Design a protein around this ligand. Structure first.
Ligand SMILES: [Zn+2]
Lengths: 145, 9, 418
């Protein structure tokens, strides 16, 4: 019924087995490597709570390509957290969480200009003047009406 | 045949 | 806490970018060094080509030709997106069917022509009219494919969302060593499968010549207007789309069946100088079935006429305020192999006019359903039968945005020849 997971910062979580095994990484550490508790070096407690909350909600599940309301709400978090989830889901190998967190980012890009994308994700314009001119040219085809 | 006016179609 | 997009590993960035519309990728590429570098990755573009335009490119083809899916998306697919789909050329009253389609590193304009009169069941014929070819390191070329002397230089011009045109620049290629007569003899063989002899008799000899001369004055410098295939619908339907149909001495014409409540509509895709392309050739009233008698009563033309004119009357009242089948005696049918069994009949009217589309009018008739993809119309006042049969070919990019867009399209192509 329950196994133990260990956050990167040493906090231990009793978690339902079948829930935990939605992470294939965890399923492998438990069964193939015999670990208890499962040390998760790259996932901290705050993010692991959210990941378990997610996995708990989705424990019984057949998914689409449109983001269910519940998940939208779960992902009403700050960018940093959102990217932490992406990384966590990728390391833990939870396909459903990875998809939904990546679609969310993709929606944040959809339709934006280069400057709007920079402001959104705080990315610096690191092009040289010549490099910049060169990318513009390479991508004028997109305004072909 | 009824060519007398079949053409009108 | 803290993390940025820019810290995600590449594989993950590629997955996210690969999920976006290809039109967002160019903005992304201009955001920074790293995104520009990552967006070289062809898998991203190969996917964009698959999902947005239905094309899977062969990797071996790509390697041999030195072209990439980024190139394809930017310089072929996006560049020419507006000419893709299903088109009707503006050729006086004759019309036509062009399906403009993606194939590999080509975009191809395929002209679809009917089979030889009267073999309405035979498949559509199809020659290519133009192509657009992408090669490494250059813009895609536009070639005219008309003639017998191979691919050569052409031009395309995109006027609107819903109209484009083609120019051929080396018409010398449409010519033939045995002259215009051989051009004609050749065209006659493809369109009719007959010679000057079988046609010299007589009123069709004339119509066939006029058509050849008229259509060939276009030397494939042609404007195309957008058409759409009709919306499918479940209970409320018995199955829309393009059909090959007999139109007497004009030969076969292509006619689109579509449903609009308790009425079906037959719209001309190709036409003739009496009733041109774009017009409503036929209108079936789906709330006025007609019972089929035994064979011997089906043979009696006047019974059929009395019965049909009855229904016409009851219809004028309303608006004002399968078993064996045989045509009646004295009703002509170019086909003769019309099916001898049918599933049901309905009242309908057809559009007729004299040469030049003069003084068009609705005449009563009866629509006959044979099977899921063969139907007929008895032209009562002309004692004449038209036999129609579904175009089996499959068409890419031809669906309408919505039912109202279709209805709108119908009104534009009708007005063009009105
Ligand atoms: Zn040409």
């Amino acid at each position: 019924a329950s196994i133990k997971l260990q956050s990167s910062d040493g906090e231990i979580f009793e978690v339902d087995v079948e829930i935990a095994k939605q992470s294939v990484t965890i399923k492998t550490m438990l069964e193939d490597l015999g670990m208890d508790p499962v040390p998760l070096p790259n996932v901290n407690a705050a993010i692991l709570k959210k990941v378990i909350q997610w996995c708990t909600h989705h424990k019984d599940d057949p998914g689409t390509d449109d983001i269910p309301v519940w998940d939208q709400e779960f992902l009403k978090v700050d960018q940093g957290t959102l990217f932490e989830l992406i990384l966590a889901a990728n390391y833990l190998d939870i396909k459903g969480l990875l998809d939904v967190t990546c679609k969310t980012v993709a929606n944040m890009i959809k339709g934006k200009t280069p400057e709007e994308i920079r402001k959104t994700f705080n990315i610096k314009n690191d092009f040289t003047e010549e490099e910049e001119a060169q990318v513009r040219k390479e991508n004028q085809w997109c305004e072909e009406k | 045949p009824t060519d007398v006016r079949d053409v009108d179609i | 806490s803290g993390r940025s997009l820019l810290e995600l590993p590449p594989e993950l960035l590629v997955e996210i970018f690969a999920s976006l519309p290809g039109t967002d990728l160019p903005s992304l590429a201009q955001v920074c060094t790293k995104f520009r570098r990552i967006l070289h990755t062809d898998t991203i573009w190969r996917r964009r080509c698959r999902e947005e335009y239905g094309v899977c490119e062969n990797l071996r083809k790509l390697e041999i030709t030195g072209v990439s899916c980024r190139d394809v998306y930017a310089k072929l697919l996006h560049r020419y997106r507006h000419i893709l789909g299903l088109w009707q050329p503006d050729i006086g009253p004759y019309g036509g069917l062009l399906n403009v389609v993606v194939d590999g590193l080509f975009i191809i304009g395929w002209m679809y022509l009917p089979p030889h009169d009267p073999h309405v069941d035979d498949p559509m014929r199809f020659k290519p009219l133009f192509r657009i070819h992408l090669m490494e390191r250059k813009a895609a070329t536009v070639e005219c494919m008309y003639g017998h002397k191979g691919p050569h230089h052409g031009h395309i011009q995109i006027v609107k969302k819903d109209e484009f045109s083609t120019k051929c620049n080396q018409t010398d290629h449409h010519r033939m060593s045995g002259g215009r007569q051989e051009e004609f003899r050749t065209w006659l063989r493809e369109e009719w499968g007959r010679t000057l002899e079988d046609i010299f008799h007589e009123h069709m000899q004339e119509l066939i010549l006029m058509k050849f001369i008229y259509t060939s004055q276009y030397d494939n410098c042609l404007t195309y207007r957008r058409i759409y295939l009709p919306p499918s619908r479940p209970d409320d339907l018995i199955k829309p789309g393009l059909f090959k149909g007999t139109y007497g001495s004009h030969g076969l014409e292509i006619v689109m069946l579509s449903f609009h409540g308790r009425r079906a509509r037959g719209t001309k895709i190709t036409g003739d100088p009496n009733i041109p392309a774009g017009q409503q050739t036929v209108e079936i009233d789906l709330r006025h079935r007609i019972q089929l008698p035994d064979l011997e009563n089906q043979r009696n033309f006047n019974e059929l006429s009395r019965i049909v004119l009855e229904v016409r009357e009851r219809v004028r009242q309303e608006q004002q305020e399968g078993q064996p089948f045989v045509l009646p005696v004295g009703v002509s049918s170019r086909n003769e192999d019309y099916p001898r069994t049918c599933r049901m009949c309905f009242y309908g009217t057809g559009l007729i006019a004299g040469h030049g589309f003069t003084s068009p009018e609705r005449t009563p008739g009866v629509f006959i359903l044979f099977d899921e993809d063969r139907f007929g119309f008895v032209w009562l006042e002309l004692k004449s039968f038209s036999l129609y049969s579904r175009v089996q070919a499959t068409f890419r990019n031809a669906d309408a945005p919505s039912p109202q867009a279709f209805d709108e399209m119908l009104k534009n192509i009708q007005s063009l020849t009105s």
